[PDB]
Symmetry: D2
Subunit: 121 residues, 4 copies
């Protein structure tokens, strides 16, 4: 199959992505219900010629949490790897930075991890 | 927009050339002074195109997959941070560098760090 | 039950910890086989009076990877929360810093996540 | 040993008083200039007691659970980093601040950042 497709986490997120031949990732990141107000633009990059030794495919993407409905003044980046096969998976670590004053900059960034599969919950 | 658009350097001597689009897109090229990297790489990301007008920074993020026509490190870095405008413009970030690995080495796939970018002119 | 006990991850780690009444965490971190050469001292802290609203118990600990047999010139810290109940769990994020030269300091720190339970694999 | 032992301050004005034991223990107190914190808190950690003698830093880590006799923030911070000796002694760290949360808010339990500690005298 491949990176292109509809992916889901176990917490209520869905993202739809196209992986371009030369490394582009473009798509939408949304809630499980998928209403317009919860949909945000996603853009990133992936290694379009991964190693031929069984290693995963490195990738990353960003979502700024602003759309035509809402603005959280924040952005998340996910850095991870795609692993193909019967149950394709994208394993990531992420950073969510909020726009803050200088006084609050020390606590501007959340960190976490998330795994996505193409299985709809 | 104009605030983010331009040439930036980090504390290691890396170069980031970016254009901030009216729709929240970040596009440009990145040249790393460190790691398994040579020449320029494509970058893509997102920023908050309508930040708060309260002295808060502008949230943003971008990705570089470390493949270009000259080298392939089978890895990708995401930078998550905020742009702080004014006379002394800076982009303060935290980053995640993920390498494609086998499943047994996935626990040690990701490096974390922090870069401060200073705007040229 | 509680934090005190023998915990395991899904990758071949085991740790034995005592949680003191006033917040101390003290124990041993080792491989699944548990031979002397893979055993390292663990020390940390936990919140000894967690919130009474269903929230997890915050904690953290460190292992420096030096014992009487080996020295990797590195140290890992785990930051997370303990969640009690029938299948007690400790959910963590971790940072593994290696001692490096100044030239390699940018790539000194790995990041990851791990979950532990009291179930022996 | 003597290199690490002493009083340190970070870029935010926080105070770290530590004793490095011959067995690799770090013990002391921490006073934070930021966050839900007041007065001194116990800290415990570990360091590499036999670092490489090649100009590399000394790996270390420590934890503070944000409970003392005056306040309880139901959170814990771990710092992972390296001590760089000489006339200009520094401890360069990355940290993870985890708060106890309900399961629904666990995704946003952990903040990440970086602190530089400078040794007094
Ligand atoms: N609803 C908006 O309009 C909007 C505007 O801004 C944001 C930012 N967010 C989404 C978000 C997803 C993923 C991330 C992130 C942030 O940062 C880190 O990764 C949240 O405030 C949020 C609140 O509750 C959760 C939890 N959840 C379910 C969910 C609810 C609403 C969503 C949504 C997902 O997608 C858009 O809408 C996750 O799936 C979850 C959170 O984090 C992880 C990985 Cl561990 N999974 N998220 N939402
Ligand atoms: N063997 C030593 O004598 C010695 C000296 O120094 C170290 C450092 N290590 C252990 C380690 C555990 C846990 C961590 C860590 C590092 O940093 C982050 O968390 C590794 O080099 C390592 C190599 O392979 C793995 C994977 N694995 C199995 C394992 C093998 C040997 C062990 C061991 C565990 O325990 C001691 O011995 C994990 O369980 C694993 C790694 O990471 C995660 C969380 Cl995702 N799980 N680890 N080993
Ligand atoms: C170990 C070699 C792989 C690295 C390829 C280039 C990555 C550069 C990077 O992420 C820099 C982060 C600090 O600015
Ligand atoms: C939001 C309030 C909770 C914080 C309690 C104190 C934490 C201090 C901390 O980790 C500082 C990290 C930067 O030096």
């Amino acid at each position: 199959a491949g990176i292109t497709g509809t992916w889901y986490n176990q917490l209520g997120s869905t993202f739809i992505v196209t992986a371009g031949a030369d490394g582009a990732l473009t798509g939408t990141y949304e809630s499980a219900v998928g209403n317009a107000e919860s949909r945000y633009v996603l853009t990133g990059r992936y290694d379009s010629a991964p190693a031929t030794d069984g290693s995963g495919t490195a990738l990353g993407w960003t979502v700024a949490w602003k759309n035509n409905y809402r603005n959280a003044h924040s952005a998340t980046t996910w850095s991870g790897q795609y692993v193909g096969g019967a149950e394709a998976r994208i394993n990531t670590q992420w950073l969510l930075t909020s726009g803050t004053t200088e006084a609050n900059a020390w606590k501007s960034t959340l960190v976490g991890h998330d795994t996505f599969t193409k299985v709809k919950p």
